[PDB]
Scaffold this active site. Sequence first.
Site, PDB file in Angstrom:
ATOM      1  N   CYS A  56       0.795  -1.230   0.000  1.00  0.00           N
ATOM      2  CA  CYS A  56       0.000   0.000   0.000  1.00  0.00           C
ATOM      3  C   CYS A  56       0.832   1.288   0.000  1.00  0.00           C
ATOM      4  CB  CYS A  56      -0.894  -0.008   1.229  1.00  0.00           C
ATOM      5  SG  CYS A  56       0.027  -0.371   2.746  1.00  0.00           S
TER       6      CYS A  56
HETATM    7 NA    NA Z   1       1.102  -0.280  -4.590  1.00  0.00          NA
END
Ligand code: NA
Length: 436
Positions: free
Chosen positions: A409
Amino acid sequence: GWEKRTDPRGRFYYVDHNTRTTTWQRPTAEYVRNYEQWQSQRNQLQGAMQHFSQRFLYQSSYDRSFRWKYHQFRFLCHSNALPSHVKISVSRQTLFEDSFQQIMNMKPYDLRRRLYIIMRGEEGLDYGGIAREWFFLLSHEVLNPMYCLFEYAGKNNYCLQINPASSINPDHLTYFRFIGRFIAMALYHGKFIDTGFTLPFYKRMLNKRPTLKDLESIDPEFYNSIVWIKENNLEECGLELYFIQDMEILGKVTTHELKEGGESIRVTEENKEEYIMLLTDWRFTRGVEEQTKAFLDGFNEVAPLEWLRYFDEKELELMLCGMQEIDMSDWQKSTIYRHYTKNSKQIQWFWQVVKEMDNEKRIRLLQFVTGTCRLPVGGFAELIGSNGPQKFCIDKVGKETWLPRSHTCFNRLDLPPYKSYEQLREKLLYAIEETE
Ligand code: NA
């Protein structure tokens, strides 16, 4: 505007005058939001098409390597190929409506026949070019918030997932069955898509259990809370959870039991590994059961899911999206150091192992660090994460005995301060290669 026109079959729908769209979904500020951010990307496509056409895979001709697994799969396809062909007619602006009507009125086996697609009006017999454009165009066409089939957990286009509320489209299951047939076709015919499915979505198709690491790639917020529960063992302290998870389903809340009598059973130490596991299990499976089964039934008709059993989540995404050439110069130029520098021995060693690696081993390093094999238009500088565009980062985190840890992320690699080239190499190779 808003409105509320009615269907030949008496079902009520909405006429969004703010977009210029008709949907089954109440056209909120967020729906109009979603639709415009979708729109842009639909127009940032003909410039991008050249990028996506650079995608490649191997040429058809040790062991237990992606490449053998692939050429074996290619063979399984060619062996089950049926004679003659299937021609699908579409228009540049009617690409989704059209493909849906024609592939849903066709029996699954006809779809293993050699493909050919016709761009209505436009001169040029097919050959690979129009199938390439078709597969890519339609790969995005399916994400139109108009149809209610998908949504995103995080920033803009981060973490594609199935909209639990998709049931607001009475044909949600026909459409998810079509998406299944379609994505399967792409693998049968060697073409590529850019739909955006994640590694945990690819795990279900493979019947592989998603993990506590895997929530970091969908709900980084939620992954931490659970990590907080696991690590901060606790003295129970400032915590009172029960084996439950509510879910807001088109307004009405409903409290789901992770296990039997779950609302009653309190989270405790020792107990919490069971709960973490169950919660993790709930997060991928909740709201999307029939949508996902229709996808898979949809996929199985065309290319039996059992044919992918020897692939891991990464090999399969790569089978669907294809490989790009990882330019080591763009990579390095677009990399940030945290508790490290450029001259750190672990960094100079890290690039040395990346210099060894062939392209696929590097793609495998990219999937690991960012949650996907797809390198964006504009390369390593245009790397995107859950909190919008984020550059590849390496951080000095660890014990020497540890294995490198990714943060898909944020595209960050927690690289410990290993004692040697060879230690770091093995550890990186290991983390990346997993167990194949
Ligand atoms: Na990513």
